Design a protein around this ligand. Structure first.
Ligand code: FMN
Ligand code: FMN
Lengths: 149, 151
């Protein structure tokens, strides 16, 4: 019970970035990008159109989530993986990418919808957390050893 | 250059929740909710529809960000604040709410779009981080004291 322009003004208001691609060959050529995508990646919507997103891995290919995504795109199944991507200015950021296949009610053929969340904050937090836990364990072990004497 | 049901399948695929409300009086009655909202809040979409979202603050109406939102609702300007909300089962979760106004081709229109992000995970980390940092400091002090009496 809502208007189309309302749906569009919703998609503009998204925090996480959103992309829509047609599986046209081995690549997934992008036919739409929302403004949040432009803001996160720094890439202009006109720059991205009719291409595959693999360019966000500017030199950091071979991350295993890529193979996971390959399998998910082959089987027509959704997926969610964390990658290291690179903006226009080369800024490295962590990207929780969630891909959903979309079939039509008249045909079990596909469109792919991608959603990118900048987990960079969260990831740095987790890494720091693990480092600090290691440190704590270290100090506690040495204190126990000394206490033994 | 894309289809309408395509936009609908897009908004359904969102991780963060999305709500659309018409500013009707003091309340902001919601006319639409996306599935991410149902999943995050646990409330049934049919229960929420012709009501206002203030029910998510099950008594925790003393959070100050609310006043900010009130002012933002008065002047028709966007806003974003973090609140502690409560699902149907009462489980407390942290909610980054982002509100954007939407006007008609006549500048005087009343639509509000809300976006809810579940920051709970991040928040717990920070809390654990602080707590954990405390623990480390404690141990580091005691290990010094013993060594101070060993040589
Ligand atoms: C809809 C969609 C969005 C994607 N978004 C990203 C992205 O933001 N960053 C990224 O590194 N890969 C993204 N990918 C993955 C690449 O397009 C590509 O599928 C992946 O790198 C594996 O393909 P390849 O082995 O040919 O490189 C996306 C894929 C799809 C289908
Ligand atoms: C679109 C929209 C979404 C909202 N979502 C939430 C929410 O998820 N949680 C919450 O505590 N308040 C939310 N609010 C705020 C309440 O609806 C209400 O405006 C706020 O509590 C202040 O109004 P009050 O002082 O009358 O309670 C939302 C408001 C709008 C307009």
């Amino acid at each position: 019970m809502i208007n189309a322009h309302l749906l569009q003004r919703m998609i503009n208001a998204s925090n996480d970035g959103i992309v829509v691609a047609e599986q046209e060959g081995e690549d997934n050529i992008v036919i739409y990008v929302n403004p949040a995508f432009e803001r996160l990646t720094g890439y202009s919507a006109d720059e991205v159109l009719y291409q595959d997103c693999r360019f966000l891995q500017s030199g950091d290919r071979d991350q295993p989530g890529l193979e996971v995504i390959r399998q998910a795109l082959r089987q027509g199944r959704p997926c969610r993986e964390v990658l290291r991507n690179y903006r226009k200015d080369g800024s490295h950021f962590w990207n929780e990418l969630s891909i959903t296949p979309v079939f039509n009610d008249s045909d079990q053929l596909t469109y792919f919808i991608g959603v990118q969340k900048d987990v960079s904050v969260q990831v740095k937090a987790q890494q720091r957390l693990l480092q600090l836990e290691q440190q704590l364990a270290e100090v506690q072990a040495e204190l126990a050893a000394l206490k033994a004497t």
